[PDB]
Amino acid sequence: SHMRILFLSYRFNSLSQRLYCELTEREHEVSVELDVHPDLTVEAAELYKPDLIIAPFLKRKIPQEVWKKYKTLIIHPGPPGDRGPNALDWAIMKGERIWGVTLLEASEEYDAGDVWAYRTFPMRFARKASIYRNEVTEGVVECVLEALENFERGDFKPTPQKEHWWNPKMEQELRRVDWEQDDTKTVLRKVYASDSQPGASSKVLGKEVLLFNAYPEEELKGKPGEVLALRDEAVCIGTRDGAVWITHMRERKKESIKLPSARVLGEFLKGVKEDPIKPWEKVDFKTYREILYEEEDGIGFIHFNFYNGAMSTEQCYRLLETIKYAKKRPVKAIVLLGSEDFFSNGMNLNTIENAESPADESWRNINAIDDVCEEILKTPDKLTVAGMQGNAGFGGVFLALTCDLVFAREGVVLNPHYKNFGNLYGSEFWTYTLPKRVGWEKGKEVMENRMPISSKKAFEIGLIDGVFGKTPKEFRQRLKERIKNFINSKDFYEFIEKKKKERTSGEWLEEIQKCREHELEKMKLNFYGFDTSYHIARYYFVRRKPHFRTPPYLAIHRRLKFS
Numbered sequence: 001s002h003m004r005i006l007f008l009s010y011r012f013n014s015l016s017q018r019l020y021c022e023l024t025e026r027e028h029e030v031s032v033e034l035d036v037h038p039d040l041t042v043e044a045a046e047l048y049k050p051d052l053i054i055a056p057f058l059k060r061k062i063p064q065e066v067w068k069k070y071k072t073l074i075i076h077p078g079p080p081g082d083r084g085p086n087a088l089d090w091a092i093m094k095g096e097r098i099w100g101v102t103l104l105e106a107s108e109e110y111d112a113g114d115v116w117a118y119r120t121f122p123m124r125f126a127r128k129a130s131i132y133r134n135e136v137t138e139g140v141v142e143c144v145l146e147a148l149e150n151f152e153r154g155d156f157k158p159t160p161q162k163e164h165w166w167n168p169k170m171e172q173e174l175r176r177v178d179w180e181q182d183d184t185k186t187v188l189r190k191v192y193a194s195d196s197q198p199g200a201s202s203k204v205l206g207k208e209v210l211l212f213n214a215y216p217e218e219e220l221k222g223k224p225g226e227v228l229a230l231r232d233e234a235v236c237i238g239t240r241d242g243a244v245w246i247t248h249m250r251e252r253k254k255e256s257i258k259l260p261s262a263r264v265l266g267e268f269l270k271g272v273k274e275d276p277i278k279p280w281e282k283v284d285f286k287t288y289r290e291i292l293y294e295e296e297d298g299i300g301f302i303h304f305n306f307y308n309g310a311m312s313t314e315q316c317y318r319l320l321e322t323i324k325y326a327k328k329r330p331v332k333a334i335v336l337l338g339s340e341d342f343f344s345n346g347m348n349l350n351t352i353e354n355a356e357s358p359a360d361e362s363w364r365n366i367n368a369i370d371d372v373c374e375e376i377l378k379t380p381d382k383l384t385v386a387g388m389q390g391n392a393g394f395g396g397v398f399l400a401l402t403c404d405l406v407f408a409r410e411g412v413v414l415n416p417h418y419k420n421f422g423n424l425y426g427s428e429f430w431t432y433t434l435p436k437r438v439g440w441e442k443g444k445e446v447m448e449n450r451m452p453i454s455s456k457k458a459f460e461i462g463l464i465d466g467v468f469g470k471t472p473k474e475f476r477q478r479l480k481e482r483i484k485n486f487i488n489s490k491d492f493y494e495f496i497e498k499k500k501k502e503r504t505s506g507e508w509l510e511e512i513q514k515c516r517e518h519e520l521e522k523m524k525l526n527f528y529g530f531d532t533s534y535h536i537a538r539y540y541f542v543r544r545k546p547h548f549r550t551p552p553y554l555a556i557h558r559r560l561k562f563s
């Protein structure tokens with residue numbers, strides 16, 4: 001019953017990773033072939049001889065030689081009968097109330113194969129990536145697990161499609177924001193449909209840009225197209241009936257880097273005044289709040305919505321300032337909540353690559369995230385909690401591990417490792433937090449593993465302290481009630497008493513410092529030494545360069561001892 005399954009994916013993306021966790025933790029073997037060349041895909045399937053092929057994310061046709069020989073099921077992020085490469089883009093642009101996902105059989109015509117499973121769900125008015133990572137992903141997991149059981153059953157007959165419609169690749173002219181003609185709702189719809197790829201084209205201050213990560217603004221009312229304000233490198237732009245914040249942009253050029261808006265517009269933003277809102281301020285209206293601090297029931301909650309989970313050096317210092325604020329408050333616990341889509345993905349590779357010296361900026365960024373980690377660790381008189389509502393990878397996983405307690409939503413995927421990105425040693429005090437949780441033996445195994453793990457697996461191995469809730473909202477409510485009941489028990493004051501004794505002693509203070517300097521010694525060699533694999537890997541990743549090989553940690557079939 002344990003199947004051998006081959007994934008065909010354009011990239012090993014969030015959906016591919018989630019499915020990888022769901023299948024392998026059910027004791028199926030999953031090998032991945034990235035979509036490099038049809039000839040390579042033919043070879044992959046003849047080497048691996050899968051029981052079943054699943055294509056979670058693919059942008060071109062599987063060759064007939066493969067799907068006529070091996071049963072091949074393709075994910076489509078739309079309901080049955082929807083066909084085309086940009087299903088979610090069109091669903092958002094058209095304002096569809098209900099949407100869905102479909103698992104269909106490979107065929108010669110795009111998205112025309114018989115249906116193995118499907119789920120429908122109501123749409124949210126939200127970024128494409130948010131729909132993809134939540135509703136679409138959860139529905140795909142259900143369809144794939146259902147198709148697996150039906151495949152093992154042996155007698156299954158898929159349903160041919162009846163009604164169908166085709167939506168082609170959406171052109172940039174359809175996404176383009178015209179500030180004079182588009183009200184705020186229209187700007188949001190266009191950016192949402194284009195986020196995180198490929199962006200909504202527009203002209204801001206006479207510059208051709210692509211827009212990402214929009215938020216309505218209800219106070220600042222200016223003139224259509226006028227850059228009204230700057231807040232944490234996001235810009236606020238007047239629309240037909242109001243204003244919208246745009247936090248990130250990209251020059252309308254090949255292989256340009258997605259960056260905070262202020263680093264793209266740059267010289268054209270002289271005279272635009274910063275308009276700050278401290279995270280702890282209460283505000284009556286809709287606006288962009290990168291970081292939000294709220295106190296409830298003796299708990300201080302810190303939301304930090306860093307686009308794509310990437311924490312630039314400057315974002316790290318803004319988070320650090322909010323943590324220091326919270327530590328002076330009369331709360332018994334501080335909870336780091338990240339955002340709904342990500343807890344954290346560690347250093348911001350985009351702002352590093354864009355820096356005059358990416359090596360220097362790497363150094364600044366890793367010291368800044370370590371300063372956040374050290375501030376959390378040196379909190380002897382309050383409980384600290386990491387609540388991972390969404391995925392965490394790289395330095396962001398070990399950020400969470402500096403908190404006393406780590407909890408995650410069901411279905412969150414963790415990448416507690418670096419080795420994919422030119423073998424960084426990592427820091428964030430992992431040489432202290434990881435052995436304390438799972439020991440050194442199991443600790444090195446965790447960081448040697450280059451594949452994702454679910455929050456359920458992380459809990460089973462003792463990497464985190466609990467997993468609960470199906471949605472961000474349900475996770476936050478359960479987390480709050482769990483912490484509330486703990487900080488009002490006797491074991492809280494007993495826990496804090498032991499934490500005070502330990503984290504005020506010089507021996508603990510000394511051990512922590514030695515951990516940081518050892519990790520940063522290794523990291524400095526990653527950044528400045530003869531090996532430049534980190535810099536090369538960074539260049540390809542941030543500029544969306546295509547894959548030319550599937551590495552052996554993904555492709556079981558491309559390993560040496562294979563038969």
Ligand SMILES: CC(C)(COP(=O)(O)OP(=O)(O)OC[C@H]1O[C@@H](n2cnc3c(N)ncnc32)[C@H](O)[C@@H]1OP(=O)(O)O)[C@@H](O)C(=O)NCCC(=O)NCCS
Pocket residue numbers: 012013014015055056057058059074075076077085088128129132133195196197258308309310311345346347348349350
């Ligand atoms: C984007 C999409 C294509 C899926 O990819 P994904 O969910 O983003 O997968 P990932 O796990 O790699 O997400 C990581 C993101 O966080 C960014 N990120 C993470 N850590 C980062 C860091 N330290 N620094 C900078 N950026 C970071 C990544 O750059 C990436 O963002 P990007 O999409 O702008 O490149 C999805 O939105 C979509 O629309 N799919 C439809 C296509 C389809 O289904 N076709 C048919 C399939 S059979």
Ligand SMILES: Nc1nc2c(c(=O)[nH]1)N[C@@H](CNc1ccc(C(=O)N[C@@H](CCC(=O)O)C(=O)O)cc1)CN2
Pocket residue numbers: 055058059060061062063064067074083084085105106107108109110111112113169
């Ligand atoms: N055997 C086969 N292979 C497939 C599918 C299939 O059902 N049958 N379904 C594919 C997923 N859905 C689509 C639908 C349309 C397009 C498409 O239209 N692509 C452009 C390429 C431009 C682009 O990058 O989008 C083209 O002209 O070929 C790509 C994937 C995955 N590969």
